Structures are given as structure tokens and as C-alpha cells.
RNA sequence: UAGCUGGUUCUCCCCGAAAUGACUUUAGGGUCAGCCUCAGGCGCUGACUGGGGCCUGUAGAGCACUGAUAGGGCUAGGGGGCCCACCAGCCUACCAAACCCUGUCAAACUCCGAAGGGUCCCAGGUGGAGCCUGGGAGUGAGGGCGCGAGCGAUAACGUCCGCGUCCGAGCGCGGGAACAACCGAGACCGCCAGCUAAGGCCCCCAAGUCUGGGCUAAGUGGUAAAGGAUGUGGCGCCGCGAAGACAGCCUCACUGGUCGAGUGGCGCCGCGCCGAAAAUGA
RNA sequence: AGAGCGCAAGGGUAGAAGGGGGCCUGACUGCGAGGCCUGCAAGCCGAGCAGGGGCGAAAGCCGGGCCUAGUGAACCGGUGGU
RNA sequence: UCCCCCGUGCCCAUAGCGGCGUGGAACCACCCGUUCCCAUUCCGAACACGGAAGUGAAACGCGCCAGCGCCGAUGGUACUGGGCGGGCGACCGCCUGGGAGAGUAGGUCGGUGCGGGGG
């Protein structure tokens, strides 16, 4: 995804937001700038890039770079983005998170039940050649109560989990139900 | 519970922190009106979506009633109210998420959630999930 | 540093009494009345002060 | 209703900060323990009081780990 | 176990620094509130004999020597770690005589 | 006797409070301090502001302590699925300590922490500033409003403190229909002069039925909520379509039919609609 | 450092104020610069001087207790002394 | 002037935990012995004395790795002196000056004063 922007200086950041335009910085062990980008074409494109995929921006100065998402403050009260961040990557693995597929439905969930997908991706430290679209998780063996940790993992070439190994990534659970009222309302 | 003691009022100053993001289920009830929820309207609010969706899938209660709720016995003005009447409420500033649901689709999801709301003292919006998460 | 021109226009009463000894430190007493003091740091922060009921000008 | 009491409130702080002149025996910092330490030039009493032992400009220190100090720098 | 070297600080002026080796034993009177020593009669590791107790006596009296010379009085002895005795007590009794 | 009530008589000029703290068989009373006034002395110090140093733990935030806390994972103690009882583990749509992940809460919790506040130094500041000594006091029912908290029911023209303000003493003047404290503004006297403030400029009533551009069809405006609706404009995205689409021609879909070119769903904003029952005449 | 520090909470504290031992009785006399707090009266801190002592080799420390509660003007009288 | 070690003070975790490696000439420790000084609620563990043989294992010094710990911007927001505007309200918005906490990027296996000894 690629996606235009403009440099900042000065200009009140409010000021900004009524135009439109929604602040930001690019930064990373090298450089850091203040910026901004139209709202609705930003919303647009992180509704699908959000952090796992990669995003260039165009720069007025013609240069187009590598930048991730590192993070973006909402603002509380009719959620709405105020302010987003822009890793420029470079060629050393830079750790960042990867979405993941959970396949197949669960012997629990089939035979009544609920998945609760915990992790919805995983942080990992990978190079930027390596971006994996997702990683794929064979949640058909989980029967109600079970439950896959970071260390059943489909780790693909080049890639390698930065968080817990003994993390827990989903798991199924008992269903809501009237039943269970009954027996609430005896207690 | 188990804690200490009854607590003062205090007010309900911006909505500074009182709001967060979906991070538990598909859709998600929100707070618009700041005010103090009773625990009975907690309960009301969580049978309305399960009755709704009998052998539903999730539901995710996010706050918790901690604030003793005073009241005096209709009487004149002196020691304070034992009160505890309504017992227990949280504090709910506008933009926080209330209620979370997931293992149902949207029709489920929306008519539970809604439900919800005329069980709830506030104006409240449904969520999906954008795509925003920190 | 030139000079500054200050124009009392608008009524202290009602307002918090050091506002009203900030207008006594610049010398203001009556309203719409003129008054020149010389551009300082000691100066400028007492009519910053009472900005909202004088108006000024340089000289 | 077992409440509604206190005590006669101490009037307790730093009593004299940094930068200010002091004559001997000026008391600096009336404290609950040794929420300020002793130092060049002044002793504590009983009580915690820190106190100048001479004459001069009283002066703040803190050394994290060690605590915070109060001195008093002489010249007169 | 150096709460010794606290009290000594916080009372006077011009500490007789003194450490000692299994083989070996060191002075230096100093003036903190700056931290810079005055005069350091070194022992074993200078030129001294073999007993460290009749070395002791020695060094003691030797930093006198240099020390006095340049004007010095305060006896703020630094009794390290090490209990006031034998050793110690006689690069003591060797400034308590010089 | 009356720590209570009432009454207290000529004029002009200057200044001008208090309704707080402490103690009080004290609580509508007193004593000292605070605030007013007069005289003498001191003489740039005073409020306020600039620069600098130190002190601080509130707003906010946070979980590192004290505790609270939903979900999950993991695992001592309870019940066991396959059963196995004189034994066992992955694990059970079973109750849970500790711990871990996710997610939160607190006046009497704080790893953090502002704005600000206090004080000192230097500087500006000659003001019904300031300091010292004395003579004379009154005041010690306060109130409304804004703000920060407690109490109360996130009731009261409620109550109790804190910071400020005004009324009190400015029920003198202009506006708010009328209205101590809301907006404007501090009345020495005179004038058949001028300029503005707030608020206004259709008539009552001074001043534009002013100019340019929108919105509203309810008398909204002329003062109510959850909630509800093809009210009405503005904005945006998502589905069908001249490969003929949307309605109705039993039809919706769709082709020949044909008006054939728009149509269906959602979301955001402005103004309005319903919700909306009271006692002398509107 | 979540223990302890006689007791409530708090602040403080292991670079001790906590625990153990040796010797000791400054839970001294006569004073007290300078201050905290403060309407008054009270309350609190205190270096230092003199006298005669304690512990330490010494620098030094000791005018009770880690600190903040554990209290009562005057009047009237008892008791011991001058 | 430069390197290494020893004693000491300052900054007070970017100085720490852990892991690996390195130093015994000197220094230091460990170490040998318990007669003398001194010591154990018992023990020469500790304090202490007299000292060779041995060792760098322990401890310590020096040097590497960022797993934990620790430090941590910029940007934006909260909050807020002061000045305003909006609703019945629980509340909300603007101007102006100040501006966090969290989180991101990153940093960090220290720095330095004095004295002594060794090359
Ligand atoms: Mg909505
Ligand atoms: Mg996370
Ligand atoms: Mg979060
Ligand atoms: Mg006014
Ligand atoms: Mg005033
Ligand atoms: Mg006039
Ligand atoms: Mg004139
Ligand atoms: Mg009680
Ligand atoms: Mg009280
Ligand atoms: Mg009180
Ligand atoms: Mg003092
Ligand atoms: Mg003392
Ligand atoms: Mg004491
Ligand atoms: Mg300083
Ligand atoms: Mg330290
Ligand atoms: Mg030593
Ligand atoms: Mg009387
Ligand atoms: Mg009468
Ligand atoms: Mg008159
Ligand atoms: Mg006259
Ligand atoms: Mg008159
Ligand atoms: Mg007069
Ligand atoms: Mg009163
Ligand atoms: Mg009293
Ligand atoms: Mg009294
Ligand atoms: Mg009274
Ligand atoms: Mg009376
Ligand atoms: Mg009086
Ligand atoms: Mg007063
Ligand atoms: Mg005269
Ligand atoms: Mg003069
Ligand atoms: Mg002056
Ligand atoms: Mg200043
Ligand atoms: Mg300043
Ligand atoms: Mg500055
Ligand atoms: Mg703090
Ligand atoms: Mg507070
Ligand atoms: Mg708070
Ligand atoms: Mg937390
Ligand atoms: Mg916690
Ligand atoms: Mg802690
Ligand atoms: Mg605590
Ligand atoms: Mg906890
Ligand atoms: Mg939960
Ligand atoms: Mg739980
Ligand atoms: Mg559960
Ligand atoms: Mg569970
Ligand atoms: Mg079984
Ligand atoms: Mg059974
Ligand atoms: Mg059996
Ligand atoms: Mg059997
Ligand atoms: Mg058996
Ligand atoms: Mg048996
Ligand atoms: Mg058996
Ligand atoms: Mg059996
Ligand atoms: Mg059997
Ligand atoms: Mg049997
Ligand atoms: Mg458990
Ligand atoms: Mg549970
Ligand atoms: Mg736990
Ligand atoms: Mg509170
Ligand atoms: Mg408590
Ligand atoms: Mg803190
Ligand atoms: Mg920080
Ligand atoms: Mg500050
Ligand atoms: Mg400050
Ligand atoms: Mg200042
Ligand atoms: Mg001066
Ligand atoms: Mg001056
Ligand atoms: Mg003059
Ligand atoms: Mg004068
Ligand atoms: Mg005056
Ligand atoms: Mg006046
Ligand atoms: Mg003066
Ligand atoms: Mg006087
Ligand atoms: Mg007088
Ligand atoms: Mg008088
Ligand atoms: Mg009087
Ligand atoms: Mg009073
Ligand atoms: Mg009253
Ligand atoms: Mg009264
Ligand atoms: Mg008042
Ligand atoms: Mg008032
Ligand atoms: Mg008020
Ligand atoms: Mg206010
Ligand atoms: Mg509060
Ligand atoms: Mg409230
Ligand atoms: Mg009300
Ligand atoms: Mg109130
Ligand atoms: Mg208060
Ligand atoms: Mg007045
Ligand atoms: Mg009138
Ligand atoms: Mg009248
Ligand atoms: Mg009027
Ligand atoms: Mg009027
Ligand atoms: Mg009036
Ligand atoms: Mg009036
Ligand atoms: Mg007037
Ligand atoms: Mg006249
Ligand atoms: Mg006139
Ligand atoms: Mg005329
Ligand atoms: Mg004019
Ligand atoms: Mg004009
Ligand atoms: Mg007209
Ligand atoms: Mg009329
Ligand atoms: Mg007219
Ligand atoms: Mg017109
Ligand atoms: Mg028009
Ligand atoms: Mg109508
Ligand atoms: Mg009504
Ligand atoms: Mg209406
Ligand atoms: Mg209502
Ligand atoms: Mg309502
Ligand atoms: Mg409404
Ligand atoms: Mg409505
Ligand atoms: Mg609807
Ligand atoms: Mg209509
Ligand atoms: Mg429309
Ligand atoms: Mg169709
Ligand atoms: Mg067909
Ligand atoms: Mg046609
Ligand atoms: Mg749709
Ligand atoms: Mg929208
Ligand atoms: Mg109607
Ligand atoms: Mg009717
Ligand atoms: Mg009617
Ligand atoms: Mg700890
Ligand atoms: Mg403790
Ligand atoms: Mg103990
Ligand atoms: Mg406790
Ligand atoms: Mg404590
Ligand atoms: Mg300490
Ligand atoms: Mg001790
Ligand atoms: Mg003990
Ligand atoms: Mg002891
Ligand atoms: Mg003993
Ligand atoms: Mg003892
Ligand atoms: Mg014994
Ligand atoms: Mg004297
Ligand atoms: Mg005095
Ligand atoms: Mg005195
Ligand atoms: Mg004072
Ligand atoms: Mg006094
Ligand atoms: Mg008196
Ligand atoms: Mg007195
Ligand atoms: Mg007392
Ligand atoms: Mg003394
Ligand atoms: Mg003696
Ligand atoms: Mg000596
Ligand atoms: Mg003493
Ligand atoms: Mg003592
Ligand atoms: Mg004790
Ligand atoms: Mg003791
Ligand atoms: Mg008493
Ligand atoms: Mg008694
Ligand atoms: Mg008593
Ligand atoms: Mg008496
Ligand atoms: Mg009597
Ligand atoms: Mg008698
Ligand atoms: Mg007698
Ligand atoms: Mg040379
Ligand atoms: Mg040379
Ligand atoms: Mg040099
Ligand atoms: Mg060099
Ligand atoms: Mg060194
Ligand atoms: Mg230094
Ligand atoms: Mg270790
Ligand atoms: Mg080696
Ligand atoms: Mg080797
Ligand atoms: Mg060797
Ligand atoms: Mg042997
Ligand atoms: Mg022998
Ligand atoms: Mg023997
Ligand atoms: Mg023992
Ligand atoms: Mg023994
Ligand atoms: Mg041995
Ligand atoms: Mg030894
Ligand atoms: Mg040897
Ligand atoms: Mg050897
Ligand atoms: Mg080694
Ligand atoms: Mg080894
Ligand atoms: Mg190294
Ligand atoms: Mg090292
Ligand atoms: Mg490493
Ligand atoms: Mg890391
Ligand atoms: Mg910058
Ligand atoms: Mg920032
Ligand atoms: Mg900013
Ligand atoms: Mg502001
Ligand atoms: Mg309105
Ligand atoms: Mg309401
Ligand atoms: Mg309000
Ligand atoms: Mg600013
Ligand atoms: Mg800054
Ligand atoms: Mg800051
Ligand atoms: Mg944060
Ligand atoms: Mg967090
Ligand atoms: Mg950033
Ligand atoms: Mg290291
Ligand atoms: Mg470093
Ligand atoms: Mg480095
Ligand atoms: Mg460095
Ligand atoms: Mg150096
Ligand atoms: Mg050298
Ligand atoms: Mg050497
Ligand atoms: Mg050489
Ligand atoms: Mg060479």
C-alpha cells in the first residue's frame, strides 16, 4: 500500500484537523520528521495495512520510503484517530506483529461452542524482505476447554517469534446460554 | 468484593481515560453519557443479550461495579448513609466499552448489543472492530 | 524596546483584585484613559495581565 | 457515627529554603523522620528538626540513593 | 560493614585512611568535602622490614614525618573494617609518637 | 436586675470596615488577634510584574507498593471424563491460592506528575503603597454567583469548607419585560453638547423593515428526557444497471414488454417532528 | 526490605533507629545564642559555656526511649530541705 | 604525557542481575600455622597474630554479549494559570501561555577526582 503525505512544521496540529488532514511522524534510528496525511485516504489504506502490512509514502521530495505503523492515538469519546507514527524500515529485522488465520473449525466449536481467538496476530522479530501475509494455525483439534499456545506454531522461512514462547494464542470456550440462568438465579 | 469501606462521590471530570477499544469480541457496546452504573443494571443489561441469543456464543462484561452506593433511611441530616440501596456502581465516562459479544454474526451481535442499550441509563453506539489496535 | 501606548477600556469591577493592582502598578486609574510606559519585561508582564480590559500600541 | 475527630494539626515543612540567610540555630526543616538529611553546617535534633549550626546561605542537595541534605554555606 | 568511615566523616576533617594487606599496610591522611589526600606513607609496598606489627610502629611514625611537617594535627583515625588492634593499633601508636 | 426589644434630636468635608481565628456553663454575649480610622516617627519597602533558586504531591496518568478486578492460560487444594482406587496424567461445557497474558478500578493505593501555589535574591513599581509607636472603633447571623471538594439523592432559593467576585455599604445609573448580588459601569455639582459600553436598531420605544449567503414551515423560535419516524436540506461509503436495470404491469429477480435511467441499503451533520396532561383569563 | 523498631496510624530506617554482648546510670547540676509554632497562655528544637562524671585507643557520643498521643492554669493544703 | 594494579571520594543502576572470556611479574585475595596479642552464646567460620608452600578455583580487577533490569526522546493527547463562548443539566467548545503519565524510536554491561605502587 502506498500512500501520499506532506511535511509538517509548525502549523497547529488542531488547525490541521479540521482541514482534513490528520498529523504524524515518521522516525526511525536514523531520522524522524514531522508530517501529516490526508484523513480519509489514511483511513482508507489502514483499514487493510493497519500494522502488519507495509505502507510507502510519498514525500513531496519525490522519495518514497518503507514505513510500518508503529501506533495511532485515538481520541477517547466517538473513537477517531488523532495522531499517527511511521516506522521507516531499512534491512535489519525489525520485530513487528503478523496476523494469523485460524483454519478449520474446532471440535468444540462444531459440537456446540465458542473460539475466542485471543492473539488476532504475533509479534515477531523478522527481516523487512520477510513479510509474511499471515501465518496459518490448524485450529481443528481444539475441543471445548483447549487451548494453542506460541509454541504450536506454523513459523514460516526466515521468521521467528519475539514474544512468549508459552504464550497462549486462542483457545475454545463453554457457550453463553438460558440454561445457565436457571442455575445463576438459584445461587 | 471484599475491599474497604464506602466511598465518597467524586465527580465525573472529561472522559479522559474513561474509554478504551474492542479487544475481546467482534462488536462492542460504548458509553456516550458519563454516570454511574448500577450493578442491577449490569445484570439487566448481560441476561437481555444472552436471553437474546439462547446458547449464544461470548459475552464480555469490561467494567465492574467497585463504588459503594449511599443513601439515608428518608430521615433528616446527620452520620452517613449506610445506604447501599442500589449497593455497588462504576463509574463510566463516555467513549469506554461497556459490553463485548462474539460467536455470533451481526444480526445476532447488533439486536443483542441494542438490546442492551434500553437496558443501560445512557445513549450508547455500537462497534465493530475497525482495525485499530495499539 | 520602543514605548508602549496603554488604553484602559473596559472596566475592572467584577475582576480579581490583582488584576485591579496591576492596572495601579501601570498607573491606570480612570477608564479610556491614555498612559505611556516605556517597553520592559516588568512592564509588558503586568499589561499582559490586564490584556483583556486595556489595548496597546507601540510608540 | 464513632468518627468526626482528629488532632491539632503540626505545622510541619521545609522552614527555610535554599538560597535564603540564616543565623545560627535557625531552625531549616521540621520533618515526620528524615525525609531531608543532615549536612555541612546542620545538625538534627531529637525530633528530627533539622537545624543551622552557624551562620550563612542555606543550600539543597540530593544524592538519590543516599538521600536529600541541607546545608548551610557559610561566608559570614 | 563501612559505617565506621560515616561516623568519622561527619565530625571533623582530615580521615588517617587506613588499609591493610595479608602482606602489606597503607595510610593517607585526607581532607573529604573534596576528596584529595594529604600525605600517604605506604608500608610494605614502600621498603619496610618483614613483622607487620614492628612494621606498623614504623609507617605510623614515618607518615608523622611528612605529615607534621606540612602542618597537620587532626588525629581522625579511620579505623577501617579492621578492629582497632595489634596491626592497626600500632600505625597508631607510631602517629601517636611521631 | 434585664448578656433582651425599642428609642437616641443640627450641617458640610475626608477615610471607611466586619459578619473570620482562638478560648469562653461559650453559642443572638464577651476577651485577644484580623479588618477601619486619627496622630507621631521611618522612607522605597508595598500590592502587582520580570529573572533566578529551593519547597510541594493536587489535575492527569499509572499498577511498581496496599487493595479491588473480568476473560484466559498455568497450576496447590475440591469434584472426576477414560474410571482407578489401598494410584494416575494430558484433560473434563466443575469450585479455586500462588504465578503469567489480555483488560480495568481506588479520598484514606503511587514507579510517575503538570498547570499552579509558597518563599528567598536581584529589578521595575511614589501608591489613600508599606513598616514602627500609640488614641478611637465597629465587626464576630452574612448572602448570591463562578470554581474545587464533603454531606445530600451527580434533590433543594439545601448544607459545610476552600479560591475569587459582587450585594452587604452601589435597592444610585444602562441592559436583562418587571428582579440586592446576571451583562455594562464605580453617580462632587451644573449643561435643551459630543463619544461609546452592555443590549439593541418592525410598532409600542432611541437607532437599518441595511447589504451579501444559507437553514427552518414547526409559532419551532417562545425555553423537557429516554426513545421513535420515506420531515427537510448537506456529506460519505457500500450493493444492482442501457449486457435495459427500479416500481407496476398478479409480481419482486429477469428477457422480449415498457416508462426505459436511475435504484436499493447504510452511516455522519444542520434545522425541525412526535414523545408533551392542571387546576381564576389568556 | 514486603521484617523489626513495647502499643494506633503515619513518616522514617539495614551505610540502623533493627538483633547480640562489655562496661556503665548525662531518666546530671547551673545555664542557654538562635529559632519552629502562636490571639494570650502554652507547646517544640537547640549549638554552646561552666561544674562534676560515663563509655571509647581516639575523633567523639550522653541533659532518657526512631519520632509525632500517654495529659491539667491558678487557687488551697501535705511533705522534705534552705 | 601512556598502560596496569592498590587505597579513597564524587555521580548515584546508562554504575545492576546473568552469561562467556581474561589477569598472578606486581598488586590483592585465597592460602599455611594457632606459640604470642585478640576471638567463638560452639568452631581460628568471623575478629587476631606469625608467615613460607600452593592457586587464580572462590572473591576481586579488566573485557565482551542487550535475555531481565535500568535509562528513554520526537510527535500527539490529557490536564491546566489567564481570557472567552454554549446547554436543563451530568457537561461541552474556542483563544492564549505552560504541558505530562503511558507507549513508540532508541540508549545502556559505566563515568570521574585525588593519592600510592609497578612498566
Ligand atoms: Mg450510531
Ligand atoms: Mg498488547
Ligand atoms: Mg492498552
Ligand atoms: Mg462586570
Ligand atoms: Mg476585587
Ligand atoms: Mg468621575
Ligand atoms: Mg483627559
Ligand atoms: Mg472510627
Ligand atoms: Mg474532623
Ligand atoms: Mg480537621
Ligand atoms: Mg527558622
Ligand atoms: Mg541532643
Ligand atoms: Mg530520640
Ligand atoms: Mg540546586
Ligand atoms: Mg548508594
Ligand atoms: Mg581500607
Ligand atoms: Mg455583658
Ligand atoms: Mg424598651
Ligand atoms: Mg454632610
Ligand atoms: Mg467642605
Ligand atoms: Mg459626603
Ligand atoms: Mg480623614
Ligand atoms: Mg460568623
Ligand atoms: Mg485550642
Ligand atoms: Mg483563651
Ligand atoms: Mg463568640
Ligand atoms: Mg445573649
Ligand atoms: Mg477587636
Ligand atoms: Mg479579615
Ligand atoms: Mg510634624
Ligand atoms: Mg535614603
Ligand atoms: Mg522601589
Ligand atoms: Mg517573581
Ligand atoms: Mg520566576
Ligand atoms: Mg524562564
Ligand atoms: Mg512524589
Ligand atoms: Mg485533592
Ligand atoms: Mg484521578
Ligand atoms: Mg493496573
Ligand atoms: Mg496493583
Ligand atoms: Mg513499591
Ligand atoms: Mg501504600
Ligand atoms: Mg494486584
Ligand atoms: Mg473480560
Ligand atoms: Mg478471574
Ligand atoms: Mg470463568
Ligand atoms: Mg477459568
Ligand atoms: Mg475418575
Ligand atoms: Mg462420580
Ligand atoms: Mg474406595
Ligand atoms: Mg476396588
Ligand atoms: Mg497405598
Ligand atoms: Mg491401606
Ligand atoms: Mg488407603
Ligand atoms: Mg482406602
Ligand atoms: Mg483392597
Ligand atoms: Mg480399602
Ligand atoms: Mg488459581
Ligand atoms: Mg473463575
Ligand atoms: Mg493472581
Ligand atoms: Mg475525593
Ligand atoms: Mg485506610
Ligand atoms: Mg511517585
Ligand atoms: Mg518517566
Ligand atoms: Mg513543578
Ligand atoms: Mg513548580
Ligand atoms: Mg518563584
Ligand atoms: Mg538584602
Ligand atoms: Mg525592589
Ligand atoms: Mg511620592
Ligand atoms: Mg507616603
Ligand atoms: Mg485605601
Ligand atoms: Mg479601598
Ligand atoms: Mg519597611
Ligand atoms: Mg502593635
Ligand atoms: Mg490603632
Ligand atoms: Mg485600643
Ligand atoms: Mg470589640
Ligand atoms: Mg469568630
Ligand atoms: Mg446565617
Ligand atoms: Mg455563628
Ligand atoms: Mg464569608
Ligand atoms: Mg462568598
Ligand atoms: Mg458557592
Ligand atoms: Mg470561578
Ligand atoms: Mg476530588
Ligand atoms: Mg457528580
Ligand atoms: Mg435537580
Ligand atoms: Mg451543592
Ligand atoms: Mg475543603
Ligand atoms: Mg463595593
Ligand atoms: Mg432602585
Ligand atoms: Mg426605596
Ligand atoms: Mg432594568
Ligand atoms: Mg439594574
Ligand atoms: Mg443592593
Ligand atoms: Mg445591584
Ligand atoms: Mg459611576
Ligand atoms: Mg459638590
Ligand atoms: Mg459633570
Ligand atoms: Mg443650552
Ligand atoms: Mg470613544
Ligand atoms: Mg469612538
Ligand atoms: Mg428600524
Ligand atoms: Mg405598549
Ligand atoms: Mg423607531
Ligand atoms: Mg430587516
Ligand atoms: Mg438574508
Ligand atoms: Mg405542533
Ligand atoms: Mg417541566
Ligand atoms: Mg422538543
Ligand atoms: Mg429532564
Ligand atoms: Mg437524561
Ligand atoms: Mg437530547
Ligand atoms: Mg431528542
Ligand atoms: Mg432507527
Ligand atoms: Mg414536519
Ligand atoms: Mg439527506
Ligand atoms: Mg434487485
Ligand atoms: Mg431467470
Ligand atoms: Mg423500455
Ligand atoms: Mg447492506
Ligand atoms: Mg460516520
Ligand atoms: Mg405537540
Ligand atoms: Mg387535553
Ligand atoms: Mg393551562
Ligand atoms: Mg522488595
Ligand atoms: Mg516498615
Ligand atoms: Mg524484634
Ligand atoms: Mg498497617
Ligand atoms: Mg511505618
Ligand atoms: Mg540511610
Ligand atoms: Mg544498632
Ligand atoms: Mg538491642
Ligand atoms: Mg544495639
Ligand atoms: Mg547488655
Ligand atoms: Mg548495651
Ligand atoms: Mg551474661
Ligand atoms: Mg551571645
Ligand atoms: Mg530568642
Ligand atoms: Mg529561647
Ligand atoms: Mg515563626
Ligand atoms: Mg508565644
Ligand atoms: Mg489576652
Ligand atoms: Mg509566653
Ligand atoms: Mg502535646
Ligand atoms: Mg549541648
Ligand atoms: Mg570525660
Ligand atoms: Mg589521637
Ligand atoms: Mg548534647
Ligand atoms: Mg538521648
Ligand atoms: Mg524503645
Ligand atoms: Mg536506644
Ligand atoms: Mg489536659
Ligand atoms: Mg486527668
Ligand atoms: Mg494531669
Ligand atoms: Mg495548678
Ligand atoms: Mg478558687
Ligand atoms: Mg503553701
Ligand atoms: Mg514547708
Ligand atoms: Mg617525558
Ligand atoms: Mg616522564
Ligand atoms: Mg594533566
Ligand atoms: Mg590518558
Ligand atoms: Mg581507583
Ligand atoms: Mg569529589
Ligand atoms: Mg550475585
Ligand atoms: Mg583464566
Ligand atoms: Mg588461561
Ligand atoms: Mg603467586
Ligand atoms: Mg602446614
Ligand atoms: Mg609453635
Ligand atoms: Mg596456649
Ligand atoms: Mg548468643
Ligand atoms: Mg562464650
Ligand atoms: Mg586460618
Ligand atoms: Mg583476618
Ligand atoms: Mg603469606
Ligand atoms: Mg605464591
Ligand atoms: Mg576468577
Ligand atoms: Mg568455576
Ligand atoms: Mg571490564
Ligand atoms: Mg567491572
Ligand atoms: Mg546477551
Ligand atoms: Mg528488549
Ligand atoms: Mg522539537
Ligand atoms: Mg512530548
Ligand atoms: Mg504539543
Ligand atoms: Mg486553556
Ligand atoms: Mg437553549
Ligand atoms: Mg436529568
Ligand atoms: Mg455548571
Ligand atoms: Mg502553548
Ligand atoms: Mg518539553
Ligand atoms: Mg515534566
Ligand atoms: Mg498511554
Ligand atoms: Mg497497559
Ligand atoms: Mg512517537
Ligand atoms: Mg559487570
Ligand atoms: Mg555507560
Ligand atoms: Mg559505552
Ligand atoms: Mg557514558
Ligand atoms: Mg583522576
Ligand atoms: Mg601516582
Ligand atoms: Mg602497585
Ligand atoms: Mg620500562
Ligand atoms: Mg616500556
Given at each position: 500500500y502506498r500512500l501520499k503525505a506532506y511535511y509538517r512544521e509548525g502549523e497547529k496540529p488542531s488547525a490541521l484537523r479540521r482541514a482534513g488532514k490528520l498529523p504524524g511522524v515518521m522516525y526511525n534510528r536514523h531520522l524522524n520528521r514531522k508530517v501529516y496525511v490526508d484523513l480519509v485516504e489514511f483511513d482508507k489504506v489502514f483499514r487493510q495495512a493497519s500494522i502488519h502490512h507495509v505502507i510507502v509514502l510519498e514525500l513531496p521530495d519525490g522519495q518514497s520510503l518503507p514505513t510500518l505503523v508503529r501506533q495511532v492515538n485515538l481520541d477517547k469519546r466517538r473513537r477517531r484517530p488523532e495522531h499517527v507514527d511511521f516506522f521507516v524500515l531499512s534491512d535489519e529485522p525489525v520485530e513487528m506483529y503478523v496476523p494469523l488465520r485460524f483454519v478449520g473449525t474446532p471440535a468444540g466449536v462444531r459440537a456446540g461452542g465458542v473460539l475466542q481467538e485471543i492473539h488476532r496476530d504475533i509479534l515477531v522479530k523478522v527481516s523487512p524482505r520477510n513479510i509474511p501475509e499471515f501465518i496459518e494455525v490448524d485450529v481443528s483439534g481444539l475441543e471445548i476447554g483447549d487451548s494453542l499456545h506460541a509454541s504450536d506454531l506454523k513459523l514460516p522461512p526466515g521468521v521467528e517469534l519475539a514474544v512468549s514462547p508459552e504464550e497462549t494464542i486462542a483457545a475454545v470456550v463453554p457457550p453463553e446460554d438460558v440454561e445457565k440462568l436457571a442455575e445463576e438465579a438459584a445461587a | 468484593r471484599m475491599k474497604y469501606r464506602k466511598q465518597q462521590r467524586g465527580?465525573?471530570?472529561?472522559?479522559?481515560?474513561?474509554?478504551?477499544?474492542?479487544?475481546?469480541?467482534?462488536?462492542?457496546?460504548?458509553?456516550?453519557?458519563?454516570?454511574?452504573?448500577?450493578?442491577?443494571?449490569?445484570?439487566?443489561?448481560?441476561?437481555?443479550?444472552?436471553?437474546?441469543?439462547?446458547?449464544?456464543?461470548?459475552?464480555?462484561?469490561?467494567?465492574?461495579?467497585?463504588?459503594?452506593?449511599?443513601?439515608?433511611?428518608?430521615?433528616?441530616?446527620?452520620?452517613?448513609?449506610?445506604?447501599?440501596?442500589?449497593?455497588?456502581?462504576?463509574?463510566?465516562?463516555?467513549?469506554?466499552?461497556?459490553?463485548?459479544?462474539?460467536?455470533?454474526?451481526?444480526?445476532?451481535?447488533?439486536?443483542?448489543?441494542?438490546?442492551?442499550?434500553?437496558?443501560?441509563?445512557?445513549?450508547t453506539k455500537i462497534v465493530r472492530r475497525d482495525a485499530y489496535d495499539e | 524596546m520602543p514605548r508602549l501606548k496603554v488604553k484602559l477600556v473596559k472596566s475592572p469591577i467584577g475582576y480579581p483584585k490583582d488584576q485591579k493592582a496591576a492596572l495601579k502598578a501601570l498607573g491606570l486609574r480612570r477608564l479610556q484613559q491614555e498612559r505611556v510606559l516605556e517597553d520592559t519585561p516588568a512592564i509588558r508582564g503586568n499589561v499582559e495581565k490586564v490584556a483583556h480590559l486595556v489595548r496597546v500600541e507601540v510608540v | 457515627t464513632k468518627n468526626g475527630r482528629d488532632s491539632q494539626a503540626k505545622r510541619l515543612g521545609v522552614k527555610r529554603y535554599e538560597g535564603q540567610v540564616v543565623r545560627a540555630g535557625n531552625i531549616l526543616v521540621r520533618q515526620r523522620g528524615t525525609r531531608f538529611k543532615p549536612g555541612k553546617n546542620v545538625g538534627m535534633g531529637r525530633d528530627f528538626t533539622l537545624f543551622a549550626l552557624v551562620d550563612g546561605v542555606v543550600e539543597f542537595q540530593d544524592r538519590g540513593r543516599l538521600g536529600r541534605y541541607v546545608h548551610v554555606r557559610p561566608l559570614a | 560493614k563501612f559505617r565506621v568511615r560515616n561516623r568519622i566523616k561527619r565530625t571533623g576533617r582530615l580521615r588517617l585512611s587506613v588499609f591493610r594487606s595479608l602482606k602489606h599496610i597503607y595510610a593517607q591522611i585526607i581532607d573529604d568535602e573534596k576528596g584529595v589526600t594529604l600525605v600517604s606513607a605506604s608500608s610494605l609496598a614502600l621498603k619496610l622490614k618483614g613483622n607487620k606489627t614492628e612494621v606498623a610502629r614504623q609507617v605510623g611514625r614515618a607518615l608523622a614525618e611528612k605529615a607534621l611537617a606540612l602542618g597537620i594535627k587532626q588525629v581522625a583515625f579511620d579505623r577501617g573494617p579492621y578492629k582497632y588492634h595489634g596491626r592497626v593499633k600500632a600505625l597508631a601508636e607510631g602517629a601517636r609518637e611521631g
Open positions: - | 465527580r465525573l471530570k472529561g472522559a479522559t481515560k474513561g474509554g478504551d477499544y474492542v479487544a475481546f469480541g467482534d462488536f462492542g457496546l460504548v458509553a456516550l453519557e458519563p454516570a454511574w452504573i448500577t450493578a442491577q443494571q449490569i445484570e439487566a443489561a448481560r441476561v437481555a443479550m444472552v436471553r437474546h441469543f439462547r446458547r449464544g456464543g461470548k459475552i464480555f462484561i469490561r467494567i465492574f461495579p467497585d463504588k459503594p452506593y449511599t443513601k439515608k433511611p428518608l430521615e433528616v441530616r446527620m452520620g452517613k448513609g449506610k445506604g447501599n440501596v442500589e449497593g455497588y456502581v462504576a463509574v463510566v465516562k463516555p467513549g469506554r466499552v461497556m459490553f463485548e459479544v462474539a460467536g455470533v454474526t451481526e444480526e445476532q451481535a447488533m439486536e443483542a448489543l441494542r438490546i442492551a442499550g434500553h437496558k443501560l441509563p445512557i445513549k | - | - | -
